[PDB]
Amino acid sequence: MYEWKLNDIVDNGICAKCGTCTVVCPNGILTFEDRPKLTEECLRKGNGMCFEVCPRVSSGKYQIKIREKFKEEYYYGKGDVEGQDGGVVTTFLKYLLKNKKIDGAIVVGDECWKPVSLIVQNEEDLMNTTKSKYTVSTLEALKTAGEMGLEKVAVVGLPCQINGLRKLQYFQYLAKHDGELGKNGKPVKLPKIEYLIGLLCTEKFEYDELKETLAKYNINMDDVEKFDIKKGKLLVYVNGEEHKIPLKEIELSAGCKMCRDFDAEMADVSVGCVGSPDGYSTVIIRTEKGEEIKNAIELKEGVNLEAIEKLRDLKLNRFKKEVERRKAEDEKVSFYWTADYGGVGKRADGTYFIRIRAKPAGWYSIDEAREILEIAEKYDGKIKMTNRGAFEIHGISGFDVEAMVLELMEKGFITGSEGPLVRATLACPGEGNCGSGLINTTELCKILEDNFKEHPAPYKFKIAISGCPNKCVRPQIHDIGIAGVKFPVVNEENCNGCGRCAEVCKIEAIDIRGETSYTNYNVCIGCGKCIKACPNEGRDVKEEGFMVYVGGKTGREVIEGVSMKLMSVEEILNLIDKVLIVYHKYAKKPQRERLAAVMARIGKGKFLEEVKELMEQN
């Protein structure tokens, strides 16, 4: 009926039926019935925020996870309400409402097992939403919460819903622009999602399919008191009886076959039954927001982690079997999980490139280079050497990306230097390799990489380290630049005006006069060459070390960083850490505002003064 880009996901059985896309539309022309659908013509043909938040187009997982910095602490517990298992989810939501942490909760109730998305603002309304509904649910109450103007909500969701809503939270980083403007010039109205409470999930069903399946076992769904999925069985409690149906005999919603995420790995806290005794819920705490559940539930340790891990593996194997089937039948596949990994980019022709983060100063062992070539050959890749000294492998099929990246990681290689984060530090050969080198660039590069590699930033962030003021790797137009320097001072007792030093100074900073020489320090760049060329011990070291620049860049615009001063390695590490903090503080446009643009916007002195203050608190 209407042209809509996501029809590619929905019409080919890849859609998770999570409901994320239908809550973000600023024109309100999307609704979720049995699937996402347009209620009228979209002038963009679906080229917009719906498509951009869809977790089955692209997971966004790597860029989200490096920001959330997930932990993984395993507990089990029970609350004080009768729930599906322990009543933990509802008890936690009651605690968050009581303590004014949220204005409401987005939860799933039911009308005779037909799920309904609800915005609940009080304990009484929350009590109708306990228990699992094992059929397609939506997130539509998020739109209602936004119409009501609620500031903050918690959302309970299946893994696919958690993944969509993490893309919503991180939209500016993943889509690289602000939320889509509607016809009236304004973005969609939605509450802030303050807590993401995830459910473990192996599958959900279409309501009609479940009801028909039950009818085959002479069960009237309308009469069921409770459903459960335990140990490969659908449990059905009706008329005071427990009925078991093997899950193998029930058709799952088609999109669950394309699913990889069992335990809602991106949630603040994930809750399930696997791994914990009956009557308790398993609780996997991953973030500081999730850590607040400790205040709501008396938690215990002793989870059966292997029971959880086996379901992770079973779900992954199901996904792999379905992808292989689609490959064999030439059916549509959306390679949404390529974004689980750093260093993966999509080429113009729909295959991918994999960037191996450049090693310090571009040194590679022969064995290392041979290993890269062997992996490239195995996957039909083509070698491209980048201008930061990285191997980049081109032409990789979406079907091979994950396997190849994992093989590279097993051999010890890090894929990365892509996306809004600290890119591979670029250093020259430096002292003891290049005859002009004044500092150990390789080791400083290794130190900077060890401390900051792949650390997130509002936009790409690039560091360069040159061994001398020739600045071959261009530190004076990098976000942070370091250049080795060694300034001379003439020794009056020894210099005899022989004249040799002036000959090696290409910038002509030396004045040979009578029986002596001078240095013009308004021109001298501290290359140290005159000190090394003098045969008469006529030039001593005035000052030497690591010269530092902050706030430069190339690309669309050339900006020279602000010259700072000579700094020690400890000071440089402090500086980089605090620059990243102040950049985060003031950046307003992820994936658009480089550090130099933030400094320009707020004032170079103001930005540098705040960095110095944080450094001194360190």
Ligand X SMILES: Cc1cc2nc3c(=O)[nH]c(=O)nc-3n(C[C@H](O)[C@H](O)[C@H](O)COP(=O)(O)OP(=O)(O)OC[C@H]3O[C@@H](n4cnc5c(N)ncnc54)[C@H](O)[C@@H]3O)c2cc1C
Residues 488-517 that bind Li ion (CB under 5 A): 511-512
Residues 454-493 contacting Cl ion, CB under 5 A: 456
Checking DSSP bridges between strand 192-199 and strand 152-157, what pairing results, if any? parallel
- Residue 428 within binding range of ligand SRM, rule CB under 6 A: yes
Judged by CB under 8 A, which of 58, 63, 334, 338 binds its own copies? 63
Q: How many residues bind ligand X (CB under 6 A)?
A: 32
468 is in an annotated binding site: yes
CB of 456 to ligand SF4, least distance (A): 21
CB of 299 to ligand SF4, least distance (A): 24
Applying CB under 6 A, the span of 101-109, 229-237, 428-436, 576-584 interacting with ligand SF4 comes to: 428-436
- β-bridge partners, 229: 234
Dist CA 212 CA 369 (whole Å): 59
Q: Which is nearer to its own copies, 116 or 434 (CB)?
A: 434
Judged by CB under 6 A, which of 287, 386, 397, 491 binds ligand SRM? 386
54 is in an annotated binding site: yes
Residue in the block written with tokens 């650390």:
455
Residue type for position 162: I
Residues 233-292 contacting ligand SF4, CB under 6 A: 255-256, 259, 261
Dist CA 255 CA 206 (whole Å): 11
Contact string (CB under 6 A) for ligand SF4, positions 158-197, x = contact? xxx---x---------------x-----------------
Dist CA 441 CA 232 (whole Å): 58
Residue in the block written with tokens 């509802």:
90
- Residue 498 within binding range of its own copies, rule CB under 8 A: yes
Contact string (CB under 6 A) for ligand X, positions 106-145, x = contact? -xx------x-------------xxxxxx--x--------
CB of 507 to ligand SRM, least distance (A): 9
Residues 563-592 contacting its own copies, CB under 8 A: 563-566, 588-592
Residue 54 contact among ligand SRM, its own copies, ligand SF4, none, beta carbon within 5 to 8 Å by kind:
ligand SF4
* Closest of 296, 286, 281, 106 to residue 190, by C-alpha: 106
Dist CA 527 CA 485 (whole Å): 6
Alpha carbon separation from 174 to 115, 420, 458, 587 (Å, rounded)? 31, 9, 11, 16
* Closest of 66, 46, 143, 145 to residue 105, by C-alpha: 145
Long-range contacts (CB closer than 8 Å, 24 or more residues apart) made by 501-510:
501/530, 501/533, 501/534, 501/538, 501/539, 502/530, 503/533, 504/529, 504/530, 504/533, 505/529, 505/530
Judge residue 12's burial from the number of C-beta atoms within 10 Å of its C-beta, 0-12 exposed, 13-18 middle, 19 or more buried: middle
CB of 513 to Cl ion, least distance (A): 27
- Residue 562 within binding range of its own copies, rule CB under 8 A: yes
445 is in an annotated binding site: no
79 is in an annotated binding site: no
Applying CB under 6 A, the span of 66-74, 180-188, 299-307, 468-476 interacting with ligand SRM comes to: 468-476
Alpha carbon separation from 127 to 90, 108, 130 (Å, rounded)? 8, 11, 6
- β-bridge partners, 394: 353, 382
Contacts of 491 (CB under 8 A, 6+ apart): 537, 538, 539, 540
Alpha carbon separation from 351 to 47, 338, 397, 404, 465 (Å, rounded)? 21, 11, 5, 13, 34
Residues 517-536 contacting its own copies, CB under 8 A: 517, 520-523, 525, 533, 535-536
332 is in an annotated binding site: no
Q: Which is nearer to ligand X, 5 or 152 (CB)?
A: 152
Applying CB under 8 A, the span of 88-96, 113-121, 131-139, 597-605 interacting with its own copies comes to: 597-605
CB of 178 to ligand SRM, least distance (A): 15
- Residue 462 within binding range of ligand SRM, rule CB under 6 A: yes
CB of 271 to ligand X, least distance (A): 4
Distance between alpha carbon 254 and the CA centroid of its chain, in Å? 28
Checking DSSP bridges between strand 391-396 and strand 352-355, what pairing results, if any? antiparallel
CB of 15 to its own copies, least distance (A): 20
112 is in an annotated binding site: no
Dist CA 361 CA 364 (whole Å): 9
3-state secondary structure of 53: helix
334 is in an annotated binding site: no
Applying CB under 6 A, the span of 83-91, 289-297, 358-366, 405-413 interacting with ligand X comes to: 83-91
Judge residue 516's burial from the number of C-beta atoms within 10 Å of its C-beta, 0-12 exposed, 13-18 middle, 19 or more buried: middle
Q: Which is nearer to Cl ion, 105 or 160 (CB)?
A: 160
**216 CB neighbour count, 10 Å cutoff:** 10
CB of 5 to ligand X, least distance (A): 25
132 is in an annotated binding site: yes
Contact by Cβ (8 Å): 178, 144: no
Contact by Cβ (8 Å): 388, 358: yes
- Residue 436 within binding range of ligand SRM, rule CB under 6 A: yes
Give the CA count within 13 Å in the CB-facing half-sphere of 334: 25
CB of 225 to its own copies, least distance (A): 49
- Residues in binding site for siroheme: 355, 384, 386-388, 417, 434, 436, 459-460, 462, 472, 474, 506, 553-554, 556, 594
Binding residues for [4Fe-4S] cluster: 15, 18, 21, 25, 42, 50, 54, 160, 180, 201, 256, 259, 428, 434, 468, 472, 495, 498, 501, 505, 524, 527, 530, 534
Site of interaction with ligand X (CB under 6 A): 83-90, 107-108, 115, 129-134, 137, 156-158, 199-202, 204, 229, 271-274, 281
Question: Residues interacting with ligand SRM, by CB under 6 A?
Answer: 345, 353, 355, 358, 386-388, 390, 392, 417, 423-424, 426, 428-429, 433-436, 462, 470, 472-473, 506, 553-556, 594
Q: Which residues bind Li ion (CB under 5 A)?
A: 511-512
